[PDB]
Amino acid sequence: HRIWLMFDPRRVMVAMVGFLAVLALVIHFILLSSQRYSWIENGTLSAAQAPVGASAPAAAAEMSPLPPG
């Protein structure tokens, strides 16, 4: 197609792959930080037991000491 005459395929491929990489990493990271889709910790739960409606801007306490490491 004539689009590859206007845009060099070498140049477009790097931008396209980089955009896909950033987008895939963003989505996987967003799901990891959510309560419903934190699959590394709660992936074994069934659909009924998974969290629902947990926006909760102050879901956790903000001020506390560090865990006993």
Ligand X SMILES: COC(C)(C)C/C=C/C(C)=C/C=C/C(C)=C/C=C/C(C)=C/C=C\C=C(C)\C=C\C=C(C)\C=C\C=C(C)\C=C\CC(C)(C)OC
Ligand Y SMILES: COC(C)(C)C/C=C/C(C)=C/C=C/C(C=O)=C/C=C/C(C)=C/C=C/C=C(C)/C=C/C=C(\C)CC/C=C(C)/C=C/C=C(\C)C(=O)O
Q: In Å, how far are 6, 19, 28, 54 from 16, measured between CA atoms?
A: 16, 5, 18, 34
Residue 36 structure tokens:
């419903």
Contacts of other proteins in 40-69 (CB under 8 A): 40-41, 43-45, 47-52, 55-67, 69
In angstroms, rounded to a whole number, what is the distance separating the alpha carbons of residues 36 and 54? Answer: 8
Q: How far is the CB of 65 from its own copies (least distance, A)?
A: 19
Residue 1 interface partner, choices other proteins, its own copies, ligand X, none, CB cut-off 5-8 Å depending on type: other proteins
Q: How far is the CB of 64 from its own copies (least distance, A)?
A: 17
